Amino acid sequence: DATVKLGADSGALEFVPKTLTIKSGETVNFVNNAGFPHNIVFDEDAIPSGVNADAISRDDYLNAPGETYSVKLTAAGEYGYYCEPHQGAGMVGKIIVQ
Ligand SMILES: [Ca+2]
Numbered sequence: 791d792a793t794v795k796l797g798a799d800s801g802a803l804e805f806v807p808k809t810l811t812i813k814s815g816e817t818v819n820f821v822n823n824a825g826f827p828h829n830i831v832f833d834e835d836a837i838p839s840g841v842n843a844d845a846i847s848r849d850d851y852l853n854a855p856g857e858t859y860s861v862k863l864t865a866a867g868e869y870g871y872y873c874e875p876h877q878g879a880g881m882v883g884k885i886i887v888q
């Protein structure tokens with residue numbers, strides 16, 4: 791399993807790390823950190839074949855420090871995702887599943 795912080799400790803509107811590599815079957819824990827609210831929306835155009843973007847996204851906002859969203863990914867490939875309220879500020883990331 792791995793952790794991605796939503797917002798840097800400094801307040802920067804970024805996923806930390808921006809590009810994460812995990813093995814198939816690991817759970818990714820998105821932890822609310824700074825600059826919230828944030829959400830985690832996977833991009834339909836940038837996920838492996840057969841994966842449902844809606845099913846793995848967290849649309850509803852994370853509002854409190856430490857609030858966590860966990861999701862297990864199994865299909866190998868790349869998964870592009872973003873935070874809706876901060877997509878314009880460049881809050882986008884990627885998960886590479888091996
Ligand atoms: Ca980084």
Ligand SMILES: [Cu+2]
Binds near residue numbers: 828829873
């Ligand atoms: Cu955000």
